[PDB]
Amino acid sequence: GAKVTVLGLGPMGAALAGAFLAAGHRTTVWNEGATEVASAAEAVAASPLVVVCLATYEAVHEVLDPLADELAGRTVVNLTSGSPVHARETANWAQQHGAEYLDGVIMTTPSGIGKPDYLLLYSGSQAAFDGSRGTLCALGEPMNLGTDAAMASVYDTALLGLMWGTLTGWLHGVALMGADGPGGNVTATAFTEVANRWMKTVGVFMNTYAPHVDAGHYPGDEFTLHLHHRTMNILAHASELRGVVSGLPELLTELTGRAITAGHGNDSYARLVEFIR
Amino acid sequence: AKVTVLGLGPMGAALAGAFLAAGHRTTVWNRTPGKGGSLAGEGATEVASAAEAVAASPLVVVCLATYEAVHEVLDPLADELAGRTVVNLTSGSPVHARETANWAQQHGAEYLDGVIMTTPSGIGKPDYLLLYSGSQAAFDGSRGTLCALGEPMNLGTDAAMASVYDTALLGLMWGTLTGWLHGVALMGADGPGGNVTATAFTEVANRWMKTVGVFMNTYAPHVDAGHYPGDEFTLHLHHRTMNILAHASELRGVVSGLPELLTELTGRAITAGHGNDSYARLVEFIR
Ligand SMILES: NC(=O)c1ccc[n+]([C@@H]2O[C@H](COP(=O)([O-])OP(=O)(O)OC[C@H]3O[C@@H](n4cnc5c(N)ncnc54)[C@H](OP(=O)(O)O)[C@@H]3O)[C@@H](O)[C@H]2O)c1
Ligand SMILES: NC(=O)c1ccc[n+]([C@@H]2O[C@H](COP(=O)([O-])OP(=O)(O)OC[C@H]3O[C@@H](n4cnc5c(N)ncnc54)[C@H](OP(=O)(O)O)[C@@H]3O)[C@@H](O)[C@H]2O)c1
Ligand SMILES: O=C1NC(=O)c2c1c1c3ccccc3[nH]c1c1[nH]c3ccccc3c21
Ligand SMILES: O=C1NC(=O)c2c1c1c3ccccc3[nH]c1c1[nH]c3ccccc3c21
Ligand SMILES: [Cl-]
Ligand SMILES: [Cl-]
Ligand SMILES: [Cl-]
Ligand SMILES: [Cl-]
Ligand SMILES: [Cl-]
Ligand SMILES: [Cl-]
Ligand SMILES: [Cl-]
Ligand code: NA
Ligand code: NA
């Protein structure tokens, strides 16, 4: 068991501390196998690894600024949510004072800490990540995004956008399947059983199209934007017939229509990245 | 097993090829001659007329351009289809699936309607799905042979289900892919933490999609029960973080329409007093 300090005992902070304790680490906490101290100065002095999980980065700076001298030679893992610039500014300050800095984001809620298949994403000091990965595994599956401390904040936002696109298309499909009409009156649970299997194919599409974006070359092969637009129009008609009004078909047909007007009808879906950036 | 394929366009030709690769005695027919040469070289028996093809096998797999084409081909063969099983993988509307199923019933053919959830090059490969609805006897008796095309799923007894499932699953795909595109553009943009490649983002997104899948499985029973407990991720938190996504996307020049769609939808549910509920409550605000 390694020595680890947690700063912040809100619902998430308290969950982080409990996961470290459960893995057998010598856990000091500040806001019963944990050692609770009254001051953050005492908490920071107790451990070479300081895991921070406060409400805001403004709170981070209020807590950590008076401890600049006390942070020399320590490793700071900052799981507070906030902006990319705030992660970067905190990283630069930590470097100034000789603390190894790793910024991270928690891709679950407190009840998911310590459970399988939940991600915590980190960016910043590679030496901090490699040295602390074994202890950080107590919280969930750690991923090292790279060396730029601000990356984790951007990844969280982008990944939530992906989640909301998926879940909104799921809701649209649930409503289409549940509606009255031939082939309808299907439960959400039955639809989702098939959807679960289908997502493996959707994952093939995302892994096929990422190289297209990075190359700036978008070969349509057997599923061109012409075919997307045609079948999107079917989706729109079907949704109107069955009373599903989500705005997704209107968004899809407008976006693909602009690429087709521009002459890229034979390209893959990846071409559409040029029409949102 | 003896199987007939009617239709040798790109998809139908792929279906016949997959039946051949699984060892089935495969008979093929197409309206235009001269599209079965490669299949014949792979062991298919090509015949000149649809009547010969239907006569050749107890299982008749149909993959034509439209359901109008299906009826042009099958209607003269009503008496010849009695006692056979028709599996119709043609694309079209739920009503056309039902009308064809009713016609098959009248003439004594067991009818299974289906949809192919891949392109011709995906036929016969792992993970790709073929979805079927209609005669449970047809599905159970034919599943072993149909396995040659891809993983078969029996959606249930109503022939029109496959058509609706295809449309619904494509909507789910587009929602996912448009959220993925939005994320690629946000990750790739200039700014702190940015200039990340789409390939690097997608490697992380692949792992994240497992969690997203868990959300869908948690929320499906909410829809079916009409009870939407928000637990630790309520609509209040969705709306708050959606506003962050909208702000971030504007600063980095990502203009997809998705944040505005999300915040308007969640805002309507919060105004209605459902801020403590799960994402599943939003089904009531699109239906
Ligand atoms: N909760 C989740 O589901 C979840 C999921 C992913 C990420 N996160 C992130 O994890 C972080 C914390 O989670 P949380 O929601 O449990 O924390 P929180 O509820 O948002 O705020 C509670 C914690 O922040 C501390 N704090 C706030 N302002 C402070 C200040 N000026 N000085 C010292 N401490 C201060 C609180 O201490 P006091 O209030 O006692 O002063 C308490 O420890 C947040 O950034 C959140 O976005 C949370
Ligand atoms: N290709 C795909 O990626 C894909 C994916 C999923 C589902 N599907 C569905 O699978 C079906 C076939 O796909 P496909 O592209 O390979 O075929 P297709 O291009 O959609 O149409 C070609 C087939 O339809 C036949 N056909 C059309 N009109 C006919 C008529 N009046 N009488 C007799 N036969 C007629 C053609 O015979 P001729 O050669 O003589 O014209 C040929 O066998 C379609 O419903 C398609 O939507 C296709
Ligand atoms: O407050 C913010 N201002 C921002 O610009 C911003 C902010 C937050 C934020 C605030 C509280 C909790 C979690 C958070 N995530 C954030 C962001 N992610 C991004 C990705 C690209 C560009 C900008 C952002 C961005
Ligand atoms: O109403 C429709 N008219 C159509 O032509 C149609 C319709 C629906 C539909 C209506 C309500 C719910 C789910 C639905 N799926 C549909 C379709 N899928 C196709 C594939 C190829 C050609 C046409 C279609 C097609
Ligand atoms: Cl519903
Ligand atoms: Cl009905
Ligand atoms: Cl059902
Ligand atoms: Cl699955
Ligand atoms: Cl097309
Ligand atoms: Cl011939
Ligand atoms: Cl980009
Ligand atoms: Na962070
Ligand atoms: Na069909």
PDB file of all heavy atoms in Angstrom, chain B residues 101-119:
ATOM      1  N   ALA B 101     -46.385 -10.391 -46.641  1.00  0.00           N
ATOM      2  CA  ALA B 101     -46.623 -11.492 -45.707  1.00  0.00           C
ATOM      3  C   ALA B 101     -48.044 -12.017 -45.828  1.00  0.00           C
ATOM      4  O   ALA B 101     -48.269 -13.233 -45.823  1.00  0.00           O
ATOM      5  CB  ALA B 101     -46.365 -11.043 -44.271  1.00  0.00           C
ATOM      6  N   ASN B 102     -49.013 -11.114 -45.924  1.00  0.00           N
ATOM      7  CA  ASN B 102     -50.403 -11.540 -46.079  1.00  0.00           C
ATOM      8  C   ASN B 102     -50.594 -12.308 -47.381  1.00  0.00           C
ATOM      9  O   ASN B 102     -51.291 -13.330 -47.414  1.00  0.00           O
ATOM     10  CB  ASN B 102     -51.322 -10.326 -46.037  1.00  0.00           C
ATOM     11  CG  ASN B 102     -51.309  -9.605 -44.692  1.00  0.00           C
ATOM     12  OD1 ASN B 102     -50.892 -10.145 -43.657  1.00  0.00           O
ATOM     13  ND2 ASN B 102     -51.805  -8.392 -44.704  1.00  0.00           N
ATOM     14  N   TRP B 103     -49.964 -11.841 -48.465  1.00  0.00           N
ATOM     15  CA  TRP B 103     -50.044 -12.567 -49.737  1.00  0.00           C
ATOM     16  C   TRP B 103     -49.444 -13.964 -49.612  1.00  0.00           C
ATOM     17  O   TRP B 103     -50.028 -14.949 -50.088  1.00  0.00           O
ATOM     18  CB  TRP B 103     -49.331 -11.763 -50.831  1.00  0.00           C
ATOM     19  CG  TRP B 103     -49.213 -12.473 -52.163  1.00  0.00           C
ATOM     20  CD1 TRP B 103     -50.117 -12.433 -53.189  1.00  0.00           C
ATOM     21  CD2 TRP B 103     -48.138 -13.313 -52.611  1.00  0.00           C
ATOM     22  NE1 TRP B 103     -49.675 -13.198 -54.241  1.00  0.00           N
ATOM     23  CE2 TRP B 103     -48.467 -13.754 -53.912  1.00  0.00           C
ATOM     24  CE3 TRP B 103     -46.935 -13.742 -52.041  1.00  0.00           C
ATOM     25  CZ2 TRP B 103     -47.631 -14.594 -54.654  1.00  0.00           C
ATOM     26  CZ3 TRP B 103     -46.108 -14.581 -52.782  1.00  0.00           C
ATOM     27  CH2 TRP B 103     -46.462 -14.996 -54.071  1.00  0.00           C
ATOM     28  N   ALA B 104     -48.261 -14.069 -48.987  1.00  0.00           N
ATOM     29  CA  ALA B 104     -47.650 -15.381 -48.776  1.00  0.00           C
ATOM     30  C   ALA B 104     -48.565 -16.305 -47.976  1.00  0.00           C
ATOM     31  O   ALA B 104     -48.725 -17.485 -48.326  1.00  0.00           O
ATOM     32  CB  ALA B 104     -46.300 -15.220 -48.077  1.00  0.00           C
ATOM     33  N   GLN B 105     -49.179 -15.786 -46.907  1.00  0.00           N
ATOM     34  CA  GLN B 105     -50.102 -16.581 -46.095  1.00  0.00           C
ATOM     35  C   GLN B 105     -51.233 -17.131 -46.944  1.00  0.00           C
ATOM     36  O   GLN B 105     -51.602 -18.306 -46.816  1.00  0.00           O
ATOM     37  CB  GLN B 105     -50.684 -15.729 -44.956  1.00  0.00           C
ATOM     38  CG  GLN B 105     -51.457 -16.493 -43.880  1.00  0.00           C
ATOM     39  CD  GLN B 105     -52.208 -15.569 -42.901  1.00  0.00           C
ATOM     40  OE1 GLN B 105     -52.291 -14.356 -43.120  1.00  0.00           O
ATOM     41  NE2 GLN B 105     -52.755 -16.146 -41.814  1.00  0.00           N
ATOM     42  N   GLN B 106     -51.806 -16.283 -47.803  1.00  0.00           N
ATOM     43  CA  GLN B 106     -52.954 -16.679 -48.602  1.00  0.00           C
ATOM     44  C   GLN B 106     -52.613 -17.856 -49.499  1.00  0.00           C
ATOM     45  O   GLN B 106     -53.461 -18.728 -49.727  1.00  0.00           O
ATOM     46  CB  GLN B 106     -53.449 -15.494 -49.439  1.00  0.00           C
ATOM     47  CG  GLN B 106     -54.674 -15.813 -50.280  1.00  0.00           C
ATOM     48  CD  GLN B 106     -54.928 -14.828 -51.412  1.00  0.00           C
ATOM     49  OE1 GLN B 106     -54.737 -13.622 -51.260  1.00  0.00           O
ATOM     50  NE2 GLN B 106     -55.377 -15.348 -52.558  1.00  0.00           N
ATOM     51  N   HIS B 107     -51.374 -17.906 -49.984  1.00  0.00           N
ATOM     52  CA  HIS B 107     -50.913 -18.917 -50.920  1.00  0.00           C
ATOM     53  C   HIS B 107     -50.114 -20.034 -50.253  1.00  0.00           C
ATOM     54  O   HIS B 107     -49.576 -20.898 -50.951  1.00  0.00           O
ATOM     55  CB  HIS B 107     -50.087 -18.242 -52.012  1.00  0.00           C
ATOM     56  CG  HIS B 107     -50.884 -17.292 -52.845  1.00  0.00           C
ATOM     57  ND1 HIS B 107     -51.916 -17.711 -53.660  1.00  0.00           N
ATOM     58  CD2 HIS B 107     -50.825 -15.946 -52.977  1.00  0.00           C
ATOM     59  CE1 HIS B 107     -52.450 -16.666 -54.265  1.00  0.00           C
ATOM     60  NE2 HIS B 107     -51.808 -15.582 -53.866  1.00  0.00           N
ATOM     61  N   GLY B 108     -50.034 -20.051 -48.928  1.00  0.00           N
ATOM     62  CA  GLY B 108     -49.442 -21.192 -48.258  1.00  0.00           C
ATOM     63  C   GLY B 108     -47.933 -21.211 -48.203  1.00  0.00           C
ATOM     64  O   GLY B 108     -47.351 -22.274 -47.982  1.00  0.00           O
ATOM     65  N   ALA B 109     -47.277 -20.076 -48.403  1.00  0.00           N
ATOM     66  CA  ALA B 109     -45.835 -19.970 -48.244  1.00  0.00           C
ATOM     67  C   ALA B 109     -45.526 -19.416 -46.861  1.00  0.00           C
ATOM     68  O   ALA B 109     -46.207 -18.497 -46.396  1.00  0.00           O
ATOM     69  CB  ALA B 109     -45.241 -19.053 -49.312  1.00  0.00           C
ATOM     70  N   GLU B 110     -44.525 -19.994 -46.192  1.00  0.00           N
ATOM     71  CA  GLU B 110     -44.069 -19.453 -44.917  1.00  0.00           C
ATOM     72  C   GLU B 110     -43.181 -18.254 -45.198  1.00  0.00           C
ATOM     73  O   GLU B 110     -42.211 -18.356 -45.952  1.00  0.00           O
ATOM     74  CB  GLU B 110     -43.294 -20.492 -44.107  1.00  0.00           C
ATOM     75  CG  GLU B 110     -44.109 -21.677 -43.628  1.00  0.00           C
ATOM     76  CD  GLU B 110     -45.059 -21.331 -42.495  1.00  0.00           C
ATOM     77  OE1 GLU B 110     -44.773 -20.400 -41.702  1.00  0.00           O
ATOM     78  OE2 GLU B 110     -46.104 -22.002 -42.397  1.00  0.00           O
ATOM     79  N   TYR B 111     -43.489 -17.119 -44.581  1.00  0.00           N
ATOM     80  CA  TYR B 111     -42.861 -15.867 -44.972  1.00  0.00           C
ATOM     81  C   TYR B 111     -42.093 -15.252 -43.819  1.00  0.00           C
ATOM     82  O   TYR B 111     -42.664 -14.991 -42.750  1.00  0.00           O
ATOM     83  CB  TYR B 111     -43.907 -14.883 -45.479  1.00  0.00           C
ATOM     84  CG  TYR B 111     -43.348 -13.584 -45.985  1.00  0.00           C
ATOM     85  CD1 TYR B 111     -42.785 -13.497 -47.258  1.00  0.00           C
ATOM     86  CD2 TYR B 111     -43.354 -12.444 -45.187  1.00  0.00           C
ATOM     87  CE1 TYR B 111     -42.280 -12.314 -47.742  1.00  0.00           C
ATOM     88  CE2 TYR B 111     -42.837 -11.235 -45.660  1.00  0.00           C
ATOM     89  CZ  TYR B 111     -42.293 -11.177 -46.937  1.00  0.00           C
ATOM     90  OH  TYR B 111     -41.795  -9.992 -47.426  1.00  0.00           O
ATOM     91  N   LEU B 112     -40.813 -14.977 -44.066  1.00  0.00           N
ATOM     92  CA  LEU B 112     -39.952 -14.263 -43.137  1.00  0.00           C
ATOM     93  C   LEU B 112     -39.416 -13.042 -43.864  1.00  0.00           C
ATOM     94  O   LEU B 112     -38.821 -13.168 -44.934  1.00  0.00           O
ATOM     95  CB  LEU B 112     -38.812 -15.163 -42.659  1.00  0.00           C
ATOM     96  CG  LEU B 112     -37.939 -14.745 -41.486  1.00  0.00           C
ATOM     97  CD1 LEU B 112     -38.787 -14.613 -40.242  1.00  0.00           C
ATOM     98  CD2 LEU B 112     -36.845 -15.782 -41.274  1.00  0.00           C
ATOM     99  N   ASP B 113     -39.636 -11.861 -43.295  1.00  0.00           N
ATOM    100  CA  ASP B 113     -39.112 -10.639 -43.871  1.00  0.00           C
ATOM    101  C   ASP B 113     -37.847 -10.284 -43.109  1.00  0.00           C
ATOM    102  O   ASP B 113     -37.723 -10.573 -41.917  1.00  0.00           O
ATOM    103  CB  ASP B 113     -40.136  -9.497 -43.775  1.00  0.00           C
ATOM    104  CG  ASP B 113     -39.896  -8.398 -44.793  1.00  0.00           C
ATOM    105  OD1 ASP B 113     -38.975  -7.565 -44.580  1.00  0.00           O
ATOM    106  OD2 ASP B 113     -40.618  -8.338 -45.814  1.00  0.00           O
ATOM    107  N   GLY B 114     -36.887  -9.697 -43.805  1.00  0.00           N
ATOM    108  CA  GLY B 114     -35.666  -9.342 -43.111  1.00  0.00           C
ATOM    109  C   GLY B 114     -35.032  -8.083 -43.646  1.00  0.00           C
ATOM    110  O   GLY B 114     -35.423  -7.552 -44.691  1.00  0.00           O
ATOM    111  N   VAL B 115     -34.023  -7.609 -42.903  1.00  0.00           N
ATOM    112  CA  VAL B 115     -33.195  -6.486 -43.322  1.00  0.00           C
ATOM    113  C   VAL B 115     -31.729  -6.843 -43.119  1.00  0.00           C
ATOM    114  O   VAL B 115     -31.363  -7.541 -42.163  1.00  0.00           O
ATOM    115  CB  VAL B 115     -33.558  -5.181 -42.576  1.00  0.00           C
ATOM    116  CG1 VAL B 115     -34.987  -4.733 -42.957  1.00  0.00           C
ATOM    117  CG2 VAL B 115     -33.407  -5.341 -41.068  1.00  0.00           C
ATOM    118  N   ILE B 116     -30.895  -6.376 -44.035  1.00  0.00           N
ATOM    119  CA  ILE B 116     -29.453  -6.596 -43.982  1.00  0.00           C
ATOM    120  C   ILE B 116     -28.792  -5.363 -43.392  1.00  0.00           C
ATOM    121  O   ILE B 116     -28.809  -4.289 -44.006  1.00  0.00           O
ATOM    122  CB  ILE B 116     -28.905  -6.891 -45.379  1.00  0.00           C
ATOM    123  CG1 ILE B 116     -29.653  -8.085 -45.985  1.00  0.00           C
ATOM    124  CG2 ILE B 116     -27.412  -7.110 -45.305  1.00  0.00           C
ATOM    125  CD1 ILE B 116     -29.525  -8.182 -47.489  1.00  0.00           C
ATOM    126  N   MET B 117     -28.174  -5.518 -42.222  1.00  0.00           N
ATOM    127  CA  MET B 117     -27.550  -4.376 -41.553  1.00  0.00           C
ATOM    128  C   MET B 117     -26.076  -4.245 -41.896  1.00  0.00           C
ATOM    129  O   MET B 117     -25.255  -3.906 -41.044  1.00  0.00           O
ATOM    130  CB  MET B 117     -27.759  -4.470 -40.045  1.00  0.00           C
ATOM    131  CG  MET B 117     -29.228  -4.429 -39.602  1.00  0.00           C
ATOM    132  SD  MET B 117     -30.246  -3.120 -40.325  1.00  0.00           S
ATOM    133  CE  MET B 117     -29.507  -1.664 -39.544  1.00  0.00           C
ATOM    134  N   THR B 118     -25.732  -4.494 -43.152  1.00  0.00           N
ATOM    135  CA  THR B 118     -24.390  -4.270 -43.667  1.00  0.00           C
ATOM    136  C   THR B 118     -24.498  -4.067 -45.170  1.00  0.00           C
ATOM    137  O   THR B 118     -25.578  -4.186 -45.764  1.00  0.00           O
ATOM    138  CB  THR B 118     -23.441  -5.421 -43.313  1.00  0.00           C
ATOM    139  OG1 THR B 118     -22.106  -5.065 -43.689  1.00  0.00           O
ATOM    140  CG2 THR B 118     -23.837  -6.700 -44.035  1.00  0.00           C
ATOM    141  N   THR B 119     -23.367  -3.750 -45.773  1.00  0.00           N
ATOM    142  CA  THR B 119     -23.219  -3.605 -47.213  1.00  0.00           C
ATOM    143  C   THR B 119     -22.759  -4.930 -47.810  1.00  0.00           C
ATOM    144  O   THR B 119     -22.430  -5.866 -47.077  1.00  0.00           O
ATOM    145  CB  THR B 119     -22.238  -2.467 -47.507  1.00  0.00           C
ATOM    146  OG1 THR B 119     -20.955  -2.786 -46.957  1.00  0.00           O
ATOM    147  CG2 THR B 119     -22.742  -1.159 -46.902  1.00  0.00           C
TER     148      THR B 119
END
